[PDB]
Structures are given as structure tokens and as C-alpha cells.
Amino acid sequence: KKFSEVCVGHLGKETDIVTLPIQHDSAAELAQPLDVKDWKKGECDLIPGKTAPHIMVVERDYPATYERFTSIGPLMEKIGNGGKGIAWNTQSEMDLLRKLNYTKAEGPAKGQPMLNTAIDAAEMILTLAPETNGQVAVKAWAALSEFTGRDHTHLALNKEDEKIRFRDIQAQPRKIISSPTWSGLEDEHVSYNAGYTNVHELIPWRT
Amino acid sequence: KAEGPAKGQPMLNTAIDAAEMILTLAPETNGQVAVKAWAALSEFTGRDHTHLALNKEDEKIRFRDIQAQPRKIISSPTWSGLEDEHVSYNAGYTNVHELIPWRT
Amino acid sequence: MKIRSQVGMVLNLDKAIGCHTCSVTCKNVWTSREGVEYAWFNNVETKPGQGFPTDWENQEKYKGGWIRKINGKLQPRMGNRAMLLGKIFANPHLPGIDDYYEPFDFDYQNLHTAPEGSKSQPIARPRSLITGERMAKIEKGPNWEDDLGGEFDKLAKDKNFDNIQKAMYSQFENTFMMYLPRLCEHCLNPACVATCPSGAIYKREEDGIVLIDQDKCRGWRMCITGCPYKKIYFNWKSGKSEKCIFCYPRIEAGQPTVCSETCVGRIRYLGVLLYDADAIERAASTENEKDLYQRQLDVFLDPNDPKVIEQAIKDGIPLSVIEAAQQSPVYKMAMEWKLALPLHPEYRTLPMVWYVPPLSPIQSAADAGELGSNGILPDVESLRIPVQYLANLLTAGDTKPVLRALKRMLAMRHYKRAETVDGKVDTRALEEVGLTEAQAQEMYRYLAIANYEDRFVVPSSHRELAREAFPEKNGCGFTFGDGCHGSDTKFNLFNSRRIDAIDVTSKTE
Amino acid sequence: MKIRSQVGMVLNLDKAIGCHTCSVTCKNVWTSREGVEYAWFNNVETKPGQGFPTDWENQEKYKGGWIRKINGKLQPRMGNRAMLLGKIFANPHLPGIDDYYEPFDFDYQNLHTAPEGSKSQPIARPRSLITGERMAKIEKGPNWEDDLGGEFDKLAKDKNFDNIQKAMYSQFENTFMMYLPRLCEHCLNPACVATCPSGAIYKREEDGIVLIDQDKCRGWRMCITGCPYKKIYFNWKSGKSEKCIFCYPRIEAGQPTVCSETCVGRIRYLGVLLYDADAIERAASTENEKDLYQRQLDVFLDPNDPKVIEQAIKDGIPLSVIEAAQQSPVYKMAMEWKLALPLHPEYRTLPMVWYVPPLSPIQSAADAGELGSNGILPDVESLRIPVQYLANLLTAGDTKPVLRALKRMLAMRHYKRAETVDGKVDTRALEEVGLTEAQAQEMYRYLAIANYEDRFVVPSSHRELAREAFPEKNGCGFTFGDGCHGSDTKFNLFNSRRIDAIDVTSKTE
Amino acid sequence: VMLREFHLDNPSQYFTDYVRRYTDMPMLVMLEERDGYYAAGRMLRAADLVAALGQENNPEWKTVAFNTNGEMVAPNGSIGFRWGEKGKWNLEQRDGKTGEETELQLSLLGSQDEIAEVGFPYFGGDGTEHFNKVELENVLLHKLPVKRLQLADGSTALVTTVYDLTLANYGLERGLNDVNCATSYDDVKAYTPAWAEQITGVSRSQII
Amino acid sequence: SKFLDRFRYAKQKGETFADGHGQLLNTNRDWEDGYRQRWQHDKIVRSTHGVNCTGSCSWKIYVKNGLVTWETQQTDYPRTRPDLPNHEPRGCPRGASYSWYLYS
Lengths: 207, 104, 509, 509, 208, 104
Ligand code: SF4
Ligand code: SF4
Ligand code: SF4
Ligand code: SF4
Ligand code: SF4
Ligand code: F3S
Ligand code: F3S
Ligand code: F3S
Ligand code: F3S
Prior knowledge:
6 chains; A: alpha+beta; two-stranded antiparallel ribbon; C: about 500 residues; alpha+beta; globular; Respiratory nitrate reductase 1 alpha chain (chain E); 3 iron, 4 sulfur cluster binding (chains C, D); nitrate reductase (quinone) activity (chains C, D)
């Protein structure tokens, strides 16, 4: 909040050039297949995202730092959410969050869910994550299924209506939902064991 | 039971044992039973009703868990309303929306 | 300008269901001892009625509250300092046990021990908890008038019917009744504190809770008369007086009072109010009693005003208390929406437990009626409870603020119906009462949905400030009897030392 | 024959992880006051070691427990009544503060207040909680020997190494260590009760918990010497002694003790034991100390025996207590499976907190070894902890009962492995130790799975019996200071009355 | 010891099938020419073969192995199938080109074109004075079964499986009479119980 | 000594306020522990009422001095949709008085 007012006249809507290394679990991980080439040594061309880091452009609205900090941004709805090589649509979760956290009445983030309290932030985490929201869990396993060609949604369908809430865990700790983010199952017949999904669901190790 | 007339059968010694019997057998408190119950009904109506409990098929309410926090029950064919997060429980709802006849 | 804070309370009488749950929980926790069995710190009364104790609102009879002398100075209605002391040998205005009720119990054991061959079925008869003697009949109780129990001519003696032609209300078709739950108002200008000769009653600086020091009270029993709400009850056994303690043990850690958290109707709200203590006397001594309500609002300070915030910090108000004040449901209802009103502001005590007046079924008419400004919903003019009665109860007879509160509640209803039934935006009713869509939606959030976190916004009383919480955490509760508690001087005749203190001083500075 | 009940405790040393969680929780709740900061009602010691206080097991030095005179009569090792009184002006055997450790704190504030321009980085140095003076160095603590902290020759002074050629254990390859958590044993024949001149120490009839009356204790400090487990700690500030109270406030309503419910290793079990109080002296005075263990088992009564049940009811034992006794994990481990053993039965106090001995890694050998009677799992003869050490600790030097306990634990393991790995029934090991499949499965249920409801089977102490719970429920806790608590006679000099009592007598009988 | 007793001498049905389907052991590694011997180079990729094993997408990111019929194949699951395509990034034992079921072969021993000596780095002889060391050779030459392959660029190359490379690395004698392989657990060789006893101080019998 | 404290009379006087209408005092308040120690309890247990009311309300049963002393409603029911009010605290005057029976 203080930064947002102190930066006025010094920093405004800026354009930032950010380097980003080639990421594991992204198509770019298939960078150099047979050997190592150093572009600075002229052994290859400087190709960002392959023989060098990605060169990204990031727009920053410094005066709006506080308003952005205290609200859930529009990228969740415009781009979506994901991780570990898979992505999914999370519109329904953002709609839920608008009702749970309320929304910005005005300003740069008008209409976006609020992030005023730590609880609002906790609810964001719980609602968006597949481990804590069966709806997301099924969409996540579905995304993975596209890659493997094998159905994995059966791993979360029986808990699709499950939604862990902050106040419920204050009443009693809750067991999470099987998620593609991991490799073991949260099941009532088999304990969580890493590599279990690779061995039993035939999902490859990311090697 | 270790021996006697009921040897091998589950025990009903304490009130908790009895409570667990209720919770485990009922479709309202055991998603596994809920799905089997809706499936049985589906035979009569010719319409699938298992979709009403599939999303909670792994749910199993336990006595000690409800001591920690009261738990909402599962939609069951024993009743005519839904235990849902988008629509409140309203009697006759399944007859009107699932086309299940009133027993008249 | 001296800023202080207090957790005020607002009771929404429109949602009141007169269930008394609040009274039972308080009783179980705080007053189940012999001596105060007849005392109900929290009690609910059905109106019209005379209440508990009987006719407590009749100050000409009970002499409670303050009066504003011709010279403009305030004086307890009981009398000035000398006048009051002259009444100490026998308080002439003191309410008697019969003004409350003679506490009773029943001989349940007779049901168990009745001898064989009894001529009739055994029964459990009433017995007095004061004398232990058989009572021929129970003739009174703390809630005797519940739900219009008693002839109208008796109930209508209700002080609030003053200046009202009440005959019409004795007719069946015009019947009306409402509920008034109440506790101590924990006033800014308490008459009790001012009328105690020993100075045993005080208002806590950090949270404004008013208490009767059980060590220092000498049992002069003058305070009982001083309180115009008759919320101080004499403990006939201990010989000392007791009163609602606003559940300070809970409030101190940020919890709601027992009567607030256990309110079944969900009508009680708890929120901080910051007030200028230096303006208390000026406000309470305003010439016209119909100005007391607004004068008190003027003593309440805007918690979002940086000027107030900085002053608050300078005056020692904790940051978490200021924060709580900024999201206080009580501040919104009393200051912003003007829905909450004080209880009998004319007593001049600047009460801190306020009320939102109740709506009621439309009055009897010639026909079924026509659509009014609010469509099928009621217009304020059609409500059956006479607004003048509510004004006598909450605004010193001025119907203006009561009508505003009621009209705004009805306006919110009109606006929400257009929204939820017609799926349209209709702000006609809101505009008529000076409310914006945003205000109506927030009112709805707090009054209708009323989530737990929105009903109670109680900050910690911060017991660590200006004290030594560490040794206390380690040794409080070991009640072996060190005989050193309650005094600042360390010397004690029994040559002992405090269990929860450190006697070996650090020699390394 | 006089039956009484008590909630005994069993600690499974085989599952002990020596974490001290039990010690910290007890400390936070019961002994964080100045005067007892150095006292650890529950303390954990690593063996081999001398413990807390140092060498507490050396009765020749500390004079704790009982001795059996030539005439067969019991006498406190401290001396008979006259001998003990002759030592009252200065207890010659009393442990000094240094036998425990000098309690310390640190000057943390120096880190906050160090002045600008300090020549070196500020630091928090130790200070004595006894004198408040700077301590040049901390040289002792209540858990100084944790995990073999100290030279072997020092740790090996351990009393339990008596009659053992301990040289071999000073070799790296033969290193061994175990954990011994302990509290007050709440004995059937407590030496503390017998050695207190004021008679301030007593065993509660209804639950056998032993307490030091904080009103009646006169600070004669003889009991401290009397207790052979050194579980009574002098409060140097109050001048009175205190000890583990077996968390009676919790036990009274059926809850586990704090150290039991907070035991991270899940090694503590709580269960009722019914005992014949009339046999206490006979058992404790048996001629051979190696017979004390069995003599005590003989004082424990079979809770499923109708003869005992009917006698129990006649002697006032509540039905819920008898029921709890019938599903007592402590009774199963001590009486049925013979896994639990008393701690130092030779002190002749008939301790009520027992222990299951620990298993250990196999000893050093010439090669990797061969399959034994238990296959790849250990045979009792191969365990590295010398059984004689464990016998000195739990069975007065008799290795027989220790070997039985250890062998049975290993047998259960063999049986379960055949079941879970080979999918076969192999009772060879069980038969060798006299266990049935049913017993092994129940042992497994309680020791391995160990559900909460199986670890703690604590009945209510029934505070309503022979008392008046109603007035107490209504008025307990209002600590205003009526000055009438603690005496049966109603007369009191301050002309007051009990807050939690009824003074107005019923006149209707 | 595990490999010797449960993989070679008395092959475990469970273990064998497991490493066959869940490890890169059956994967082919290209050997690099050195002075007098070979060194294990990079893993063979589908792109290295003429028809790229019918792999159009990410052929340079898909590993290769021989099926039990001596045929070379690009099994599903390799990182190349993760991007640019879908449905084949799984551990089903199938041919990444024909989509037909296949069985990967672990060792080339018994179907090799020749035996080649591959050098393995050994650091067990280095270290400070505070730790025991076992002197052998900085480079240990092992006899590995290989097969010569015709690459897409027209050149030729020798390949062996990760499986064979692993057994050699552990010092397991397989009948090729490898002087650097153990004749028994007591033989001080690069990786035996006898060897480890010297390095760690743990008794060989315990290790065994 | 409370008697000796009386001598710190004027010394415990702080600032006056409201133009002399009030006086701030700096005196002992230890007596307040009297009501604090009444509220304090051993534990709370979750229970409800087996009476035919339809309430089905979960309560916190307070145990103090090893006896049941009073009850207050639980407020931790799973919350209803954001557009609906929640159920807490439920309860009624009858239920609030149940504790009376135990030793009555
Ligand atoms: S309502 Fe409370 S604070 Fe106000 S005068 Fe009465 S007892 Fe005092
Ligand atoms: S605030 Fe507390 S003491 Fe006062 S009436 Fe309510 S429950 Fe009773
Ligand atoms: S262990 Fe406890 S009961 Fe036994 S003698 Fe010591 S203090 Fe007394
Ligand atoms: S029983 Fe209670 S008092 Fe005794 S050691 Fe355990 S926690 Fe401490
Ligand atoms: S509080 Fe009242 S309504 Fe609720 S369960 Fe108890 S008796 Fe029924
Ligand atoms: S007048 Fe004062 S002395 Fe006690 S009885 Fe009232 S608080
Ligand atoms: S009467 Fe009932 S509605 Fe609330 S204010 Fe008392 S609990
Ligand atoms: S001897 Fe007795 S007098 Fe107190 S110090 Fe020990 S309990
Ligand atoms: S040492 Fe740890 S294992 Fe239990 S007995 Fe104490 S909490």
C-alpha cells in the first residue's frame, strides 16, 4: 500500500524485459537433444527458449501494486491455470471465489474477487487446487489423459463434489484429493505411495 | 464374535458399534451404498439416477468424524430432494426433475 | 479530546423471536448461585408490559438516571452527593424482592420418597428460596407477562404508552406485541458509577465494560436505584451488588458475549465504537432530551478518518482495536444506516446497547388494501405497532428517527424483491429514504445473510499491555491461597509471596 | 478384603523414542511457577545414566523407600517415627538444588537493548533463577546425560550396572542406550505418605491418586527423602512440597493425563486396576525382594470374576469403574500377557506405573549371523541390551520375568511376519512362550494399532458421589474470596457463607 | 549381490518384468571410439536410424530398444511423445510407430555381433587421508556385448543396452571372462562386498 | 497489603476528563479474576438433545470441576451457499437448560 503511493511520479506503467530459463514440464524442455552448444562461442545461434533463456515482456502497473495484491487477477480467467505440464479452465472456480471473497467495487481490479484477509487468500488456494476441489481434480486428470491416451479421471470422479473450505478444516483436518500433480493416491484402500500412478496408471516419469 | 451362535459376525457391543452399523449401511451416509441404491431405483424407472450420488461415491461418514464436525448427508432414493451445493433440499424435487413417480 | 474504545451491541428487534435462550445461558453461567437466583443479567420482556423489575421504566417512582438542573448541570435523579448520603440508612426508592419476584423451587423429592399407601398421587409443591417455606401459590415470575399474559388494562400501564390514546389497542383486531431483550447498557455516563458512595463501580478504560468491584463494594445498595435500566441486582446473600459483566472474560480474547453467541434469532451484533470521553458530560447535559440521541452519535468517532486513527494511537488504542472499529457492524447500523437507536436516551446515561426497531403486520383496515409505494410489501404508515410507542422507548418521543429506520428496512425489502422476483433494478424506495444500492446491499449482507464473522467483530482487550503476561501465563489459576493478590504493595501480614510473580530480582539489570 | 480402584499406567519402553514431549507439556501446565521451575513432575532419562536428581536410584545414599526389619515389620529406610523426627531440624539425606540443577534463564533483552557502538555482537548470557546473578557457565541440567552425553565411566556409575561386568559396554561396537520416562508411581504403599510428619500426604480412596495437601503441608521436607523415586520436589519459594498429581482434574472426568495424551510415541496406556487394600502390607513385607513383583500381582483382582465384582460393588466401586477395569489395557499387559513390569519393586512401595522392557538391535558378533528360532528376526538371546541391566531396573535382579516379556514381544513379531509376509499360520514362537493366537492378536491390537480408545480406558472419578454436585455446578469458580472453603464447620470469624452452598434450609423437609 | 542372485543366477519373475517395463535398462546406448577401447556415449534416438523408425515428431527425443524378436523399436513413453502429439506418452509396452504390443529385450548377450571393451570411470582409489581407498585403475575396461548399426547419416556405430552397461559397472561376470569383474563376493573388484568392506568398514557378510 | 494500598490514595489518581466530570484511576483490578475463574472450564464435549423438537442442534457441553456445568451452541456446522444464511447457532431456551437435570 505504501509502495503504491510512494512510487507515484517515479514508476508508472512500465515494460519489463524478463529472462526465463528453459522450464522442465514445458515443450521447451526439448532444447538440446544430442550435445551442448554455447551461442556465445558461436557454436550455435542465440535462440531464446532453446539455446538461451526465454526473453519475456512483462507489463507492470506499479501504482496499482496494492490493488493487484489485494485481488485475484484476470489471467486465471483469460489464460487459465495449470502445472506439471498440464493446464485447465478454471472459470467456475473464479465465479465461486467472487461469491466467497466478495469483489472490488472500483479501481484497477474492479469486479475481481478480493484478497483482503489471509482467509480470502486461503480460500483462493483451496478453491483453485485440484487436491482441495474435486471439480478441479477431474479437469486436471482429464487434461493429463490427453497426453497419455488413458483415462485417469476415474481417480477423482468419486470425489468430484468435494470442496475443502478453511472453516471446515478449522473444525477437523481434511484428507486431500488424488491429483495429477503427484504420483500416489489418496485412497481408502491403498496408502499414498510415490510412483504408484506411474506403475499402475502407466503414466510416464518425466524423463 | 469369537464364538457362540453369532461366531464370525460383526459386533454390536457398544452404542458406537451400533452407530457405525447405521452409518455404514445407509445410502445417506455411505456413497457406495448410495450409488447401489440409485442403481436399484433406475431399474424401475428406466432412467439413470446414479448421477445423483456418483460425485460422492467415496464419501463415508464415521461416528468420530461427526464428533469433530457435523456432516451433510448424501442424496438418497429414500427421499425426494437433493443434498446439493447448488440447490437446497426440496421435497418432490426428484419426482419433478428426475421423473420418478410418486408412489400413488 | 480523549479517545477510548468499547465493544457496543446492537439488537435487531425486527428479527427478535422472544425465545429467552439468551437469558438461560447467562443464568447458567453467571447467576445460578443462592443470592442472585432471582437476578437475570439478561432478561427478555414482552411489550406492552411493565417488565422486570415491575415498572422499571417509571423513573418518577424508581428515581433512576440523571436530571439536568436549571443551571445546566447534571445530577443523579436520586439526589446530589449529600442528598444521596442522607438516604443511606434506608434507601427509600429501593426495589423490593417482590418487585422482581420471590424465587422458588419445587419439592421434586416428594415424588421419589412419597410413602406407600398415599391417599392421592404425590406432587411437587413450590417452596421459597428465600425462606425455605411452602408457598401456597406462585404469584409472580421474571417473565410473568410473556406474550401478553395479563389483562390489557394491566399491561398497558406500560410507561411507553404515555401520551398515546391506547384504547384502540385493547381491541382484538388491533392486538400487537413485541420483544425487548436487554442487559446492562455499559453506558458512557453511567448513573450507577455516579451513585455508588464507595466508588466500587467503574468503567474499564480499554473496553468500556462497567463493573462492580466485588472486593471494594460495601453493599450501600444505592447504585440499584441509580441505574434507570434497573440492571444492577443486589445479591441478598453476599450483601453486595452484581450486574451484567458483558462477559469480559470472553471479550478479553476476542470472543462474543454468551448472550450474543447463543442468540438463536441471530439479532445481536457486536462491534467497536470509538468515542471522545472528553465530550461525555457535554453530550449528556444537552438541554432538550430529544437531542440526546444525536448528541451521542456526535461523541462516536469515524474509525476510517486518519485524524481519528492518529489520535487513537496517541491515546493508546491498540491497532487491532482500531482495525475492528473500521469493520464494526454496530458503527454501520448506528452511524451509517441509522437503523439502530439507543434505549431510553432521555435517562442521559449515553447507553451503549442499541436497538433496531421492529416491523409488524399491517394494521386492521376496511378492505384488503391496495398496492402502496412498496407494492405488495408494507409502507411504513401501515404497520400496526404505533410508532409513537417505539419512539417513547428509543428516541425520547421523537418519531422521526424511528420512522427513518423502519422505512429504510422496508425500502431494502422492496429493492431486493424487485431484484430477486422481477429480476429488475428498482431503487425507487431506496431513493425515497436516501439509501444507495451499495448501502442496501451491505445492509442485506449484515442483516439477512448475517455470517458469524459479520455479526461479531470483537477485538482482543490485549491483557498483555501495561501488565506482565508472562509470569501470569505461568502461574495463574493455582488458587492455593497466597493471600498476596489484589494489592500493589508487597508487604503482607502472613509473610507470603505471589504465586504468579517473580520474587528473585535479576541482578544483571 | 477391601477393594479399591486406581487408574494405573503402563509405558511401553520398546516404543519409546525419548522425545521429552511428555515433560514439556507437564511443565507448561503444572510447574512453570518460580519455586518449581527446576521441578519436572515427568522427566525422561537416557540410560545408562544417573538421572534426575543425580543417582536417585542409590538408596544407600538417598535413604528412600522401605526396609523389611529382621522381625518382618516394615520401616521407612529413613528411619522409624522417632528416628525420622530426630532428623527434622536438618534432613541429613536431603537432595540439594545442585543434585537437580541450578535453574537458569538468559538475558535475551540484551539482544534488544544493546547500545549503539557496541564493540562486539551482543549476546544473551545465562543468569540464575535462584540468585538472579550472572552465571559464568551452565554446568548441569535436568537432562544433561541425554543420548549418552558424558564419558562412559561417568554414565556407568548407573546403579543398574550393579553386579554386571560393564567393561565390554565401553566399546563402540557394543554401545547401547534406552529411554526411561517417569513420573510419580502413585504407589499402593507409598513411602512418602509414611514419612510425612504432618500427615499432609494421602492416597485418594476413589482413584488411588497420591497428593500433597497444599493447605496441610507444613514444609517438613522429609517426604522428599522418603520417596525412593525422588518424585516429590520441594517448592523453594512456597516452602511446601509438590509432586505429580496424575492430572486428577482431567482423570476425574475420564480424560487421560496430559503426559499420556501428549505422548508422541504412543507408548503410554491407562487402565483401571482393582486391588485388595487389606493385602498391601502383607505383599510389601514379603521376605525376598524378588517376590515383590508377583506379590503385587496377587494384590490385583480379576475384574471379570463375579466374586470380585460383587465385592467391588459392596465396597463402593462405581459400576462404570468396574466396567473400565474389565477392558483395562494395563490389566492385560501386567496380568494377562505379563509384558509390563514394576519399576524397582524392591523399594517395597508397590508402584502403580509399570513398564514393558525394550527390545534392541542384535549384539556384535563374529559374522552376519544365522536364522534363529525367529527366522530373520531376533532371538531374545541376541539382543544387545544386557537383560541383567533391565532386571535390576524392573524385577529386583530376576531376569526370568524380563526374558519372558521380551521373548513374547519377539514371538508376536514372528507370528505376525509369517502371517503378513508368508501368508501362513506359524505359531511355533507363540507356543514356545505360552501364548495363544488370540492373545498374540490382542497384543498386536493394543501395542501395534493402538487406537486412542484402546490406549486410554479411564472412567470418571464420579465427583457427584457422597458430595453435592448441584450447588457446586452452580457456584464453583466464583473466586471472590468467601473464606469459607476448606472446612466442614460452618462458623467463620469473618461472618461469611460459602458461595457455592445453600444457606437457606428447606423447611418442608 | 541383488543383481547377481535375483537377476542373473535365479532370475526373479517379478523383478525382471519390472525393470523391463519401468526402467531405461532395455534402452540402447551409442559407444564412442577411444584409443584402444570404447566409452559409453549418448543414448540412441529414433532420429539416428534411416527411416527414423517412422517417427515424424521429435525423433531426436525418443529412445530406442530391441524387442524380443531382435527388431529395433521406439517404445511409447519417451519424452518425444509428450509434446507435439498426443496419446502415446504412456508406459504401455507398445511400438511407438505401429502401436502394436511389443516386448523389450534387456540384454544383448546371446545375440551380439561382437564383444567390445568399454571403459568405466573409477574414483574409489582417490580421496583424502581420512577415508579408506581401494586402488584399481582410474578407468576400468569391461567386456560388453554389442551390435553394429547403420545410422541415417550413412555412418556406422556400436550400441549396447543400459542393462548390460549396468551389470558391467557393478562388476558382474557374465561368461565373457572379464578380468575386472568379480569371481566371487570376496574378490576385491569394482563393486563387491569385499571391496565395500574396505571402503566402508562394514563387514562383507552383513552387506551380503 | 490492601490496607496499605489505601495510602496510595491520591497517588493512584490519573488525568481527569470531560472537564472534571470524570476521573481516570490507576488502581488494582486483580479482583476481576473472580468472574474469569468461573468461565474457565476443563473441556467442552459435543453433544445434542434426544428430545422430539426437530431442532437437532449441536452443543458444546462444558465440564468444570469434573462436572457438567452449562452449555452453549456449537457454531461450526458446514456453511450453506454464500447466498443463504448459515444455520449457526441454532438452539432454543429449552435446550439451553438441559444441564440442570444432571444433578437436580
Ligand atoms: S445500564 Fe449498566 S452502566 Fe448503565 S447505569 Fe445501569 S448498570 Fe450502570
Ligand atoms: S453480556 Fe454476558 S453477563 Fe451480560 S447479559 Fe450477556 S451473557 Fe450475561
Ligand atoms: S512414587 Fe509417588 S506415591 Fe510412590 S513414594 Fe514416591 S511420591 Fe510417593
Ligand atoms: S500425570 Fe499429569 S502431573 Fe503427573 S507427570 Fe503426567 S502430566 Fe505431569
Ligand atoms: S436446543 Fe432446543 S431445538 Fe435444539 S435440539 Fe435442544 S431442545 Fe431441540
Ligand atoms: S452503591 Fe456501591 S457499595 Fe456496592 S451495593 Fe452499589 S456498588
Ligand atoms: S430472546 Fe431469542 S432471538 Fe436472541 S435476543 Fe434472546 S436469544
Ligand atoms: S514431609 Fe510432609 S509437611 Fe510437606 S514437605 Fe513433605 S508433605
Ligand atoms: S519421551 Fe516421547 S515417546 Fe512418549 S513417554 Fe515421553 S512423549
